């Protein structure tokens, strides 16, 4: 499956002018477009090389739609201040995420259209693409307005229609990078610790896409509570890194195996120091 997602943020700054409005677009784990109201000549912009093939209409049209969205979020931020009886002096953040997950037969699998205010869920379109879930009182005001207005039907048209068709087309045009798989290159490092035991760290490097499973076992039993992991992190060149470690008794390192599962491996890897 693949996804096309847009991540939108508006942050007010009383005393320092109009709120900052930003959009970032992703295909799976790759950012390909961005807009930033603080930039000079604010314009929807390429952030992947495969998208720069699109003609000036694509960019004109996306700069129009971002600038229209920006005005809507300016009004939404002040509406929030009335809903929650907040002073106009403080800074607040409104976030929006919309996009589609498609199986690789071009068939939609889930649409998203959801919002958050000052870091908490506000309203989200449910997976039937017809009804809303409202987090609080204020969001229920928005729910009833969006129910009366038929908002879901219009937003569902985007998720079922142009989000699937443009995804499918971004995947074709960016095939070389988007439908690449890079297997992890894995190895185990050994470190003696100052009170007698050993850290074994299982590394997975240069992999794409980001999803991966890294586990340690002792004599074939998984060490689910003992393992330490780091959040998966970008290498900065389009691939990712991750590691998992365990603390083991000195002289017993060879009883432990690290196991790596990833789309780029035909079979999971088992590694042993």
């Amino acid at each position: 499956s693949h996804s096309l997602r847009y991540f939108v943020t508006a942050v007010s700054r009383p005393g320092f002018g109009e709120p900052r409005y930003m959009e970032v677009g992703y295909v799976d784990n790759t950012e390909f477009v961005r807009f930033d109201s603080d930039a000079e000549n604010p314009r929807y912009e390429p952030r992947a090389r495969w998208i720069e093939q699109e003609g000036p209409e694509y960019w004109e049209r996306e700069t129009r739609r971002a600038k229209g969205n920006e005005q809507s979020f300016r009004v939404d931020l002040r509406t929030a201040l009335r809903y929650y009886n907040q002073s106009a002096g403080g800074s607040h953040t409104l976030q929006w995420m919309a996009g589609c997950d498609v199986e690789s037969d071009g068939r939609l699998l889930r649409g998203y259209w959801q919002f958050a205010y000052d870091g908490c869920d506000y309203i989200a379109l449910n997976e039937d693409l017809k009804t809303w879930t409202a987090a609080d009182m204020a969001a229920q005001i928005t729910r009833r307005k969006w129910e009366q207005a038929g908002a879901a039907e219009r937003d569902r048209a985007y998720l079922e229609g142009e989000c699937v068709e443009w995804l499918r087309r971004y995947l074709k045009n960016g095939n070389a990078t988007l439908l690449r798989t890079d297997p992890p290159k894995a190895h185990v490092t050994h470190h003696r610790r100052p009170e007698g035991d050993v850290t074994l760290r299982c590394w997975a490097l240069g992999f794409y896409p980001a999803d991966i499973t890294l586990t340690w076992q002792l004599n074939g039993e998984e060490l689910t509570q003992e393992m330490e992991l780091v959040e998966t992190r970008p290498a900065g060149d389009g691939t990712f890194q991750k590691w998992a470690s365990v603390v083991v008794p000195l002289g017993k390192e060879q009883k432990y195996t690290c196991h790596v599962e990833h789309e780029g491996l035909p079979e999971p890897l088992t590694l042993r120091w």
């Binding site: 969205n69 809507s72 989000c163």
Partner: peptide, 9 residues
């Protein structure tokens, strides 16, 4: 292509 906002909160 990206989503457009049509209704205010």
């Amino acid at each position: 292509i990206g989503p457009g906002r049509a209704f205010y909160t």
